[model samples]
Target: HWGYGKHNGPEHWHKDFPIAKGERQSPVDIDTHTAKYDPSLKPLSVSYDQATSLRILNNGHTFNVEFDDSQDKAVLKGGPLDGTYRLIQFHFHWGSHDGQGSEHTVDKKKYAAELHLVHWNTKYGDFGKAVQQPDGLAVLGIFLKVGSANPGLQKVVDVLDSIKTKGKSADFTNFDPRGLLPESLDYWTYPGSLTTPPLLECVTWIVLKEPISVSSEQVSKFRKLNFNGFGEPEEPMVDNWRPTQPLKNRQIKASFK
Candidate 1:
């Protein structure tokens, strides 16, 4: 099974998934000095239909809030994107301890955790077909900082207890993810791949410069989750994040100066 364990970790992933060594692999370090300012980039436009919200699942990797992407009810556009992309799922990458767990870092600084809002382009008709194309996906990455309690995230955190084990699921709806976002929509953009197996190089990453707040208590609750399912030896689902990949020759564009 592919996981963050020492034996089946990211380093050994190339053995089973060759794309793990691809040039455009994701979770790259964002060097602000090197990133070019793109004044032409438009502000991010996000609209989600509250009704499209569906269930939340623990897929032995991370807890994901899946959406009804069968229609263009929830969409993300602008910020280096060519067209509208449908929201498919939103998940997080955190650590067992504070100060370590986020996938993407800026200036080599890691946050307490990271949030990913995954979306697939509508031009390709469906998520499966779009995932293999160059402009297939648009993912918004938000960094989480330890500060005041984020009342907006209380609902999501409260449900984590019920889904402590893998394969567990709970009905989650009427939730608008916009509540979790920071006031500023400024972000950094780049061409990258999924940070998971199959590692498809189809994502236009929009990583927000501003981070949202989360209390230390809330972060502790997140660490209580498990990667192992019921009846199996329990393992805490922490540090399920990929290391920063090589920047190669790609250019990092900034939506703001």
Candidate 2:
């Protein structure tokens, strides 16, 4: 298991998060990597109606928006590929610092944070069973850079004042997370794995090229979420992202260039 002061951090993460050794991880910095780009990479449609139906489970470490497998869809198409799937769950990963939260590292630099909107292919079976298949999931990663700051995320930050302790989260109402995205729709495509536990290696990663900004204060607010609960606080639990694994024989397609 990887933790602080012992065998913690990405350098030793693979020992515990073994999937990191095989499954493709993302973010990759987006620095000088050649983008054999196309300009049309964007989600077919994005809405929060289906997202709101999922169970919002706060594991004290992070909040996961679960999908109602029976009545919801979250798929994207049009740009680099064609397929439709169902939205499964979405979660956030952060960093100890404002500029190092993204999971896909480029060379060695991480981003501020990253959002993974997990979706499952309906062509096979239910999300539960599909996750086991080779082509079971599609994860769209939206990178959050610590540059300009976003106003749409204020709804999430507003609750931080109360849920600052570990294992603490509230039922938020009338919040639309889609508004948090930037105006740009460019993206990069690849095959990858889940950043969290279960380390499932059945994901198609669609990482956005243009990162939206979040203020330093907002980053601090998000970092304030306790990993244990609302009271028995451990060290500040920021930087929940995994390091970018080797692309190996994988090929990355972009929506620009």
Candidate 3:
């Protein structure tokens, strides 16, 4: 609800939104060759779907698309992601362009953008209550790269117009978000917190080593969806990414040799 142009852009955000005080921030750099890294315990499965039941919202900072329970196809696995967990919602975070993007960082490099497939383990409880547990959630992190064209991304990019403004909802059927997946599921696993508010440190982070590609134009077209609501246009609100955090004694895992 705050403006990026104010003295409270990113710095004062946690102050204005007190709930932000405990957010598990992103945009950190991950070095695959770090000292004691392991290839075991990496995520191996992720549920992906077209999200036939779609609800798009231009929440002043990013174009977030929510899905109905029927469309939930999100999951995480190489380790804990299994039949017990159900895919719930998938969302996105980006920079204004490919040069400087994404909320989660790896080894000091900020990716073009990042997509999160959020899942909750039923063993703990419902989605809301499960996410509150330190071991009840699994998030698959997919990075993006700007390229000449992105055939796999057409599904999301094509629908940009329908949700161009705030509070807009539309029906997207017969589509397949699974097409957006990278060929390799190889990832870096670590114990980290969520990127959003209440920065709960309960996530088993599975960041894909390979990034999905999208056309520069596709990324540009996505920016057309307002960052802030109408008329607050000039704000630097286009990039809704948060800076990366310290590894903080966390052990990073991978799925490859």
Candidate 4:
């Protein structure tokens, strides 16, 4: 259990998880001018079955919407991926205040928040097994900007009040994950790892170029969550994001010209 704090933060992760300093680390800065446009990149294909969504939980670090990835109920294909990848869960990272918390920054500009839709390669079978191998995970990153109130996010926000403390969870189903995506499917693709611990270099990052709008008021609701459990002293769960890692020599490819 790695945590986002002075004693256990990103700086100290390499001490316990040596892979944190690996060549293919995630949440790197996407410098648009330097990123190459690849006409050969395939269009993205997403098939999400609303019924596959199971529950929502506050895991101290962030809130996660877990899906039943027992079968290929929800899958992502064709975008810088070899085979289909099953959607396992989706979660977010945000700052305590606006203009700060996203893990991956675009051209040195950080956003209000970021959403990660995690998936595992079907070829590898289970997520547990898939995560250890290269080309085993694919994460869709959607940046959040402060603007108009997004009606699509209302459903998720309404349930936050019930699961304010860490380790709390509630039944959440029949919700389509596609509703969270932006209109444009254009994205920046690269090879990276899980931004969190173990920092396995197994993910194919598909970060959306266009950011979706969420009102300032809506962003406030997320700040209400506490990192501590019900019977413990509560600490505001915010700024739970890792700093941008070095790109090294990785080439970031864009889907569109």
Rank the models by TM-score, top first: 1, 4, 3, 2
lDDT of each: 0.90, 0.66, 0.65, 0.91
Residue range 14-107, candidate 4, lDDT tens digits: 9999989899999999998989999999999888754377899999889999999888769999989998899999999999899898999999
The TM-score of candidate 4 is 0.97
lDDT of 2 by residue, 111-204 (tens): 7887777777777678888789767887778878886668877777776656655455566655565765668776677777766655778887
Pairs that collide, model 4: none
Those runs of model 1 whose alpha carbons end farther than 4 Å from true positions after fitting are: 49-51
Off by over 4 Å in 4: 49-51
lDDT at 32, model 1? 93
Q: Pick by lDDT: which candidate is best?
A: 4
How would you encode candidate 1's per-residue C-alpha lDDT over 1-257 as one tens digit per residue? Answer: 88999999999989999988888989999999999999999999888645266888899999999888987778998778988999999999998787888999999999989999999999999899999898999999999999999987888899899899999999998777887789999999999999989788999999999999999899888888999997999999999999999988899999999
TM-scores of all candidate predictions against the true structure: 0.97, 0.82, 0.83, 0.97
Worst 10 residues of 4 by lDDT: 45-54
User: Tens digits of per-residue lDDT for model 3 on 54-82?
Assistant: 65556665665565544234444446354
Ten-residue stretch with the least lDDT total in model 3 = 69-78
